[PDB]
RNA sequence: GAGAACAGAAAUCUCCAGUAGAACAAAAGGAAAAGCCCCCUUGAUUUUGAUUUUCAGUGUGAAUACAAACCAUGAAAGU
RNA sequence: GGUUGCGGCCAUAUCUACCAGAAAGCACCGUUUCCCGUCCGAUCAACUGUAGUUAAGCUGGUAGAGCCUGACGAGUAGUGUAGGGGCAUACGCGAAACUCAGGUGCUGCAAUCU
């Protein structure tokens, strides 16, 4: 056990001597200050003293007649995010705080002796985090009651590995793509395959993309899009299980596909090509992007997170009728999508060649920015739920953060010692949890880009992790054949 | 060689918290000609090194297409 | 190579730091990054020399894990 | 009035002391197994006397408990042979009583020479409801003086049933 | 409600022992035990002193680990802790320093001679005719092998070896007693 | 057998000394008020507190050997013996031991106006937590007797010498005050001993950095009269201030690198 | 005579089998020398027909309780059957954990600090330590209710003695009254006399193996929703209770009467 | 003490108590254990912050001093 | 005021022989599918609150042994302190036994009681 060099006699003498105090009640300095919304709104000039931050925050409330708390920052070289006011004209800025705060996950929990196989995938349910499902090498998928940390009915029916599993955004039907050729449907309480499995696929399923609720009309169930090594994406009707059309534009395996809020299915493929297929176009490609040196390994969008919740916000209150649920999904999608006034769902594509590309599929095919600061392939790239921050995981043992819109580099984490696998985003964007080839789980504080806490315990090869929608609990899984839960 | 709870046992484990302090020291450390070193500490310089020197060297084009093709 | 801890056959060779295939030596395993229980990442383990460096221009060892 | 002060049998105790250790100890263990159906247990000598030849840890006895409904049947069978009587003595201050006779094989058990001649002794403990207080861990209480069993009470109880007598007068 | 506290004479603090000193003038008029305001004045003075000490104490640095509960000897990252400085008050000791050591003849001989101290390699010695290490001492070592072996080809010689070993132990004890007088 | 060896190891002098054990001995005149005072003192000294079996007839001033014998047999450095005579009403004696030998003796008496812990408002109190201390008046440092009293109180209540303290650990504070200032040569005013529990009033006026500190008295309330006093010789003082002894142009720079200056 | 004089009885709470001071010493004899971290000793006791669980920090003043709960409060969520069973202990632990979590205001002195999760330590009590004991079930329920007590599944129901593993399905069934639910059917298909004397309330309420699990789930949901801890009506105020009680209790007779009776000897 | 087939004054079997003549190695003012019973079990482990000594003065090659991990054990505090 | 969980000094709290205890609560009890340990489902582990209770536990009251407290001894015994002289006075700390009188438990938080 290495020891940090102990403080010398000089350090002891310095520590023994008292120093300044933080009461700061007297002689508050006054300097001119300006207010300007972080995104677009430029403005409320004042020259106040070194007053408490709460007073400054409440000052802007009456200006806009909102009563809502707003996150505050200034000088956006300085990069400054009484203590802040004593550093020196400071140009202050504001943005919504999203008062709902997800408490940091620090405490571990006992393991569950469920399916005896390496874990492959896992995802939290949108309606409530109390239920969770994990995929593993075993052909059978199992749901878990997070409250009691116990398994649920076993999804018997598959004869090969369940590559991908995830709840539908409405939570009505779970999809569990099988390795061999098929995807099966399981409602939360069926305990058995719901009808005949979706078959007729030449190769294994790579990823699944549910139809967003905000686009789903009342009554009709959401469509289920699938991707596979065959290089084609089939659109499946959850009710009739029939395929309306299949697109084979991709000449190689489709790495992943995301059902955008505008009805466009942004997908990447091993052919180093990105094709924006759209359901509304009767299964036709509207535009094609080709800028990656290597193939595309992952895809993500700013509004993708809002799709997976299916109007089930952090409160977890289930809607009454499909129409009001769709309306609440649409309003939330507009809120997240219309961050910069207009609805613009930014897209980012992960390139294995130590590079990532920022894309705006709704506009010209010229890339917005070429995010390129990694040393190894970026395994996973995901937009922040807020949308202003972008993070990526790579095999180079580091996690890099980038600006959501301008592409400017922000910071890089180096806590992980081995290859970093997929990561998860907190419901409030305040904390990011990442898992790596190393047998450790870590969470990073976005507020200052510092290591918050370490969560070891897994035997080895923690392949994937997810964050609950409400943020109460965080699940994990790895090759140890043991599911472990984490909570504040 | 005799078997025991010796080698196959951990002996060099570093502390997780100390890594951040070592990285900060390496980033902030500075020396002048009038200052000389006598004993260079043995630390995992590999983890401390490789700072944010984002250059992203050229892609492995050969992987996408072999020489024969 | 970090250090040599135990060379059999008159460990005076150990004091001399000779390889003497069959010795157990410490190696900086920071590259692999294996982490023991408790979150304390390990970066050094003792390994035994497998090949004979006297008759070869390279040194081979196997991690004692 | 006697709302809950009804005398109840706690357990029956059986034992066979031996003049030596070895084959006879195994025979006694087999006798215990065939009679009570309980696994044999070892009772070791607390000290070396040298008068009987027993050394420290001689394993000269096998203590076995006969608690349960089978106690009544065994006690009845034993008392049947002994003229359905017990002496005025053999009763402890608390009323616990016992006895012992030779040739245990007399009461049904097979005459087979594998066991041979083997006597036995009996010890019976009696108590009233609420004995768990002195045996439970939490709130270990005392015992009422009246609640304690007495020699006369146990003698009367043993005389009311089994048609026993004092054997002395 | 106000937290401001000040005194004419600067306050002396001992953060290493959570103590402070206030050499300010004591109001004998109100400190009298017969006065009723005495208790209130003492309470106010104690509150001011505690406020000053807390204000000074909180200025110290605080550690923030990234570990978890882990073992019983670990520390939780959530629990912020103040790093107190080294003690300043030189409290009296309770026992002297046992700097005295053993002046046994062995140390002097080693200093005179070039015999370096043994490295304490291990208990696992090697033997023959058994196919096992058979460590020298610690568990069924070679010491009792001579007695255990059933052939002493050369009066009972088995007991003689035990007697010799006991005599060597007695000689070691005698040497210990002799050196105890150093 | 190892159990006895472990105790003997603690008996032997250690480079780093643990919390000084305190032994309480009831005297021949252990009044009921004296017993209550002893119980209150123990409440602030647990778990490192030991009380004797029954009364005693030991006079520290007239008999020093018994205290040394008890300290040696119990491995207790601090000794307290409460005994009140007709002239010395409610007198309590405190003694320190260095190497099992008497270090100093001081007589402390509590006035009848003392208030017990039960008399004050009930409040939470955790055993083993290190309390805070505050000393008022220049006499504490500018006088020998007051300096000795301050040192004794600190050694009695300073607890462990840990370099890391929890924020929530500051549960209560002990207020050390004197009954007003005095001129040179005047009788020493009685030492006022008070204990106040801490209340964390919000920092409304103090912004966010520092809360408004509030105090609630819980006692015991004691006024310590000064009686007979004994002090150690200079050699004993020097011995009690020894250090374990644990570099020109030599400094361990950050990361453990051994650097130096050429000049 | 001499024995009675030259001896001292054990502590008041040690003479009776109420508290084991050996555990108290360990829970209070922390060194500590590392930090001045407070502690909250857990207290769990199982009485006849009732289960008592409490969190009580150590304090010389009497260990003032910050929060407490009782099994007899379960009917507040519709649970009445099996008040003493393993499932009832788990429910009581969950209820107390959620109650303390809510009243401490974590979610629906530490100035400038962040959210500090609570910590609690189990108490031995006087129940023999064996895997599957209801004490471990109460501990598991408390932990599931938002408590991070250090614990190991070695003593949880369904643990495999032969190998260091555990079956979570058995634990889930026990949490949902698995053993009780199975025994209900195994007695319905068996002799009815036992199923007519015992489980009489079950027959009256028409409870089956699945209705019991549904009731337990609903009770857990209600506990999560409303741990408000509403007490009883508390009629018959203290003063009249005291007046009534003194009627039967025999008070100390006046010493004058005793002196007169002694003189009358 | 009442007693318990041989068995009695020392073999066995049950109710009360040694203020604890058990062993708490023990010398001493003196425990739901420190005495007995069932499970595990290394330890002569690792780096190096005060002391020495070479013989390629060798970042320690090492015991002593101590630091912080590792382990046993338990449900945990804990040692 | 009763009972219960945690408790504060740990005999005013205990021991000996008797009597009372409704409501509410401990305790007693009835049972062994399973986790679980013993030869024994008696302790222990689990289920029921139903069958069976104040017979026991526990809390109280009566008359014996001790315990604890205040004052009487009492500034009394002892002790070195200074020279009339070869012990008394002068002069600080300061007992115990004995005598007189008193009682044989109180105490906070939470839950539940007529």
Numbering used by the authors:
A (entry chain x): 2 to 44, 48 to 71, 75 to 83, 87 to 91, 102 to 108, 116 to 515
B (entry chain m): 71 to 139
C (entry chain r): 197 to 261
D (entry chain J): 6 to 174
E (entry chain w): 9 to 162, 174 to 201
F (entry chain v): 9 to 254, 260 to 276
G (entry chain D): 10 to 117, 133 to 289
From the paper:
To further decipher mechanisms of such an intrinsic quality control pathway we analysed here the contribution of three yeast large ribosomal subunit r-proteins rpL2 (uL2), rpL25 (uL23) and rpL34 (eL34) for intermediate nuclear subunit folding steps. Nog1 is part of a range of intermediate nuclear to early cytoplasmic LSU precursor populations and its association with LSU precursors was previously found to be independent of the ongoing expression of rpL2, rpL25 or rpL34. Structure models obtained from single particle cryo-electron microscopy analyses provided evidence for specific and hierarchic effects on the stable positioning and remodelling of large ribosomal subunit domains. The structural analyses performed here provide evidence for strong and specific effects on the yeast LSU precursor folding pathway upon blockage of the assembly of three different LSU r-proteins.
Further single molecule cryo-EM analyses revealed a different folding phenotype for Nog1-TAP associated LSU particles from cells in which expression of rpL2 was shut down. Three particle populations with dominant folding states, designated here as Nog1TAP_L2-A, Nog1TAP_L2-B and Nog1TAP_L2-C could be distinguished after in vivo depletion of rpL2 (see S5 Movie for an animated overview). Finally, the third population of particles depleted of rpL2 was found in an unprecedented folding state Nog1TAP_L2-A. Here, most of the densities of LSU rRNA domains I, III and IV and the ITS2 spacer were missing. On the other hand, LSU rRNA domain VI was clearly detected and the 5S RNP was docked in the premature rotated position on LSU rRNA domains II and V. These were decorated in a similar way with factors and r-proteins as observed in state Nog1TAP-C from the control sample. As rpL2 itself and rpL43, most of its major RNA contact sites, including helix H66 in LSU rRNA domain IV and expansion segment ES31 in LSU rRNA domain V were not traceable in any of these states. In sum, the data indicated that initial positioning of LSU rRNA domain III and the 5S RNP can occur independently of rpL2 assembly. By contrast, 5S RNP remodelling and the arrangement of LSU rRNA domain IV and the 5’ region of domain V 5’ at the subunit interface around the rpL2-rpL43 complex were not detectable. Initial arrangement of the 5S RNP in its premature position was still detected after in vivo depletion of rpL2, although only in a smaller subpopulation of ribosomal particles (~21k particles in Nog1TAP_L2-A of ~98k total ribosomal particles) when compared to the control sample (~147k particles in Nog1TAP-A, Nog1TAP-B and Nog1TAP-C of total ~267k ribosomal particles). This indicates that besides stable assembly of rpL2 and its effects on the positioning of LSU rRNA domains IV and V, additional pathways contribute to enable initial 5S RNP positioning downstream of LSU rRNA domain III assembly.
